[PDB]
Amino acid sequence: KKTWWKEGVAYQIYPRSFMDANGDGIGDLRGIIEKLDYLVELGVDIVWICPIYRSPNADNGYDISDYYAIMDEFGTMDDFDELLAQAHRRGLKVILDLVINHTSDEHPWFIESRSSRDNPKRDWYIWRDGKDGREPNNWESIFGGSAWQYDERTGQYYLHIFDVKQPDLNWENSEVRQALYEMVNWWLDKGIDGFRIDAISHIKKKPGLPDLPLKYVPSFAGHMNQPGIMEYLRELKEQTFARYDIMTVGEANGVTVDEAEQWVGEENGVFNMIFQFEHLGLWERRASIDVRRLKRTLTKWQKGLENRGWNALFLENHDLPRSVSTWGNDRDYWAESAKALGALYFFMQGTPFIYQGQEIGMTNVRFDDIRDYRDVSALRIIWKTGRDNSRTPMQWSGASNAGFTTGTPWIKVNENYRTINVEAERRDPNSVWSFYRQMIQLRKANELFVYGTYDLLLENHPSIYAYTRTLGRDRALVVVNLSDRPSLYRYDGFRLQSSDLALSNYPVRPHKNATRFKLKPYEARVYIWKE
């Protein structure tokens, strides 16, 4: 089954740090509009814009106070309508986040709900009396502490799996579901091309909210992927998504490759593709990431969803440090490792996602003062694992503040922008950006990277990650040396010819009938041929 979403390349935008069109230091919608030509030039075709809905912003915008309104600092609904029009003119698809497990406590529905024990919206959230001076149950919040928050307006507590300011919607209530489907369809009718569904795995709560088998106990057994969830998700799909030509992206949170077919299966699957995070975070050993464990994790998803679902491929996001600075080497092999990592995940079976700046090799930021950081998490290892590493402003040129703003950025631009920036990288044919553009060009010109089946080679090799892609008589070999030291590639399965080398991060060296060769640090090669 051939589809645009399987064949597309997605680009993830964190609006606040992408492009500031009005000089107030905050990226906005007009900023994005100014960069649609850039997205086209790069080659991507699906644009995922992180939360832009009205929000008190207590939870990086995932605490929505109005689903039908744009966050003031990003612009107006007119700006958004204009964005879709301009994006569609260019052949681009636009998807937004769908956060429907909860709303902000400042959402008008919760404000009415919390006012009294009997108002039309009381049942829209999860209210319960406590147990003699204590919370309704022993459930802990994913955000630490009780999942219950006492409310003095009524004497009862409301459930909040996430932040205190994120009360959970009562999916048991048909009125809630219907209001949510009307909201989804409103966006779909407005013209968006799909959504990235967030935390929907918690919409179904265990039937009497009983104590779980300890101040507060991690509560996943009472609200995550609970039986009956599929009833809500299938209804969500039939009432909304199924009525349009869109794409939905989910996450395999607490979902094994086997249970993932119920979420992303092509016939009866709530979502079209899914992200998995089992590969996130890999500390280096004495001698130097654990490539074999990476091969295993990524390979089970490749083989596991083959003809059963579709993988959403990625290395970066707004909640992670930069890939070149974590998986690669930003000190000695900056460009090489960035390109290597890019070839590695980009060419697998699935739809690749490029996070803003990943295509130019943005790295972690190392501010000396804790005050230059933002995310409350850091303030409470920052240089290496911090979320801000992916939230510093996008590096467009060597201009003041990397061309991001004419004002003062809400967070400082990484000092390496004079070198790492779009303008300079597009002039350099050996830049990380140019490598990315060639990768996008390769995948578009060779559908074997889209529908070809993945097969891992040299599984036990400690440094080389090599895999093939097969579609009929069309084959390709993606070989990557994930280490800062050379490595011998040795595989008597096929003879590699230099005329078949479609892409490499190192110059194409002469070689005929090669079954072995030394790979330079972070050397990555992509061979394509036809048997």
Place this chain on the structure above:
Amino acid sequence: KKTWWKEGVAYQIYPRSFMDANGDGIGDLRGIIEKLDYLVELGVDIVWICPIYRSPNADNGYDISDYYAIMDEFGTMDDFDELLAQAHRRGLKVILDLVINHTSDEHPWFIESRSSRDNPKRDWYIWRDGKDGREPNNWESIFGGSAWQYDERTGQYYLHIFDVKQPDLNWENSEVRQALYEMVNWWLDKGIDGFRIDAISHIKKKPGLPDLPLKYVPSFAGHMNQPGIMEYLRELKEQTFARYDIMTVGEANGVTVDEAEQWVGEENGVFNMIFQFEHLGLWERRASIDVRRLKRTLTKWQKGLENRGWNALFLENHDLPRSVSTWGNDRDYWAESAKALGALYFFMQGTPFIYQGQEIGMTNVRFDDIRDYRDVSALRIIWKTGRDNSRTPMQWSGASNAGFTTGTPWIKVNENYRTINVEAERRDPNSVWSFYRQMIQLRKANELFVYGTYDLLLENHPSIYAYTRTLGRDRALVVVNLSDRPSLYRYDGFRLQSSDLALSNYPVRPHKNATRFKLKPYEARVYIWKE
């Protein structure tokens, strides 16, 4: 200087528990309108309505999100306009709370302020960088913890003397002051007759917000009654209050009787009258409140503000337990003590305030289940000192829920409403209500209780609190036996005649030339004569 505010009797309404006109269990504005005739019948003429402004209600409505709007559960601005019209038709004055030291963090001004380090409203609040990973200074919040709250949107902290959801307004900023005066005048032009000013003693912060001489240190030395505060308060008065015929009521928080003249002095005094709280809370001894300490506390204000200011007299409010249940005896001498307490504070020099239910002798509520309580404070002694004691619904009749609502009250009615309720008390000429009505009648018919000077008698007596009121040849003696056991009144200063007894809570017994007599438990007498 004779004025309506000095001659009036004020009645304090806690809107949420006064009268529910629409059956949702929450008192509202229409409820108040239905009871204006009642207020007239009782005899009061100034109506103080507690916070009714739009508020996320995180701080009992003192966290205002919109000063130009009414809290949804209380009604609409039309209801409020109608309330003023109906109140004024009846000759009643209406005052509201003025909370201008801070606003809610959900107030549109703070939402703009917190968005970026440079927006027109950034300076409207108190933002500062922290000190290497910690708060800008060591200041503690009146509400425990740091007076600073980190905000991840900018990396800076905002000052909040009160709750986290109550960021402090920057009085240093003339734009803030001007916006506040426009707001005050808007209300004054709408027709209100004055305000009860709340926490304004904190508007002036010490000039560089330095550390005070310990996790966090109580911070009163950095923001309370700080030099320069009078500059703001005098400007507030000239730009607003001085342009209308209204009354302003303040509080002597951290203000001695000597410093109080600068706040309530008649020529240059920011407020017309002031509440003092030095008398609040008096535990009983082995044998039984400390009447002498009460005599001293109340007497310094009486003599201290004589010809220098004006006292706002009271025994109850929404933050206190009921007076009969704390100062009196609600078990054996319920009615006697209620009337005694009433005569005691009511007839002093100043403007008396009657809190809703005080006039019928409402008592503390003793719910067995902590769940029937509301104020978060209780949940964190409740039967005796709880705030809810004054927030249970007003007792109008012996009807379902005391006639307060036709629905389910937001908090339960005290089980004693079948007896303690307006309907029943108005039928009973020996009820606490009837006593209150006679007290109001007495004060209106004898201006000596308004402008007459107060003088304490028998200061060293352990149980009897006796004082006189003198205006020219018109004199009165208010004598009260504050104890559940009889007491001998003995004073050779004047001979009391039974024909001069204007009011008593016990039958008028025959006596001529009495310089001594035994007073029954909680017996209170008010003699009026002309020398």
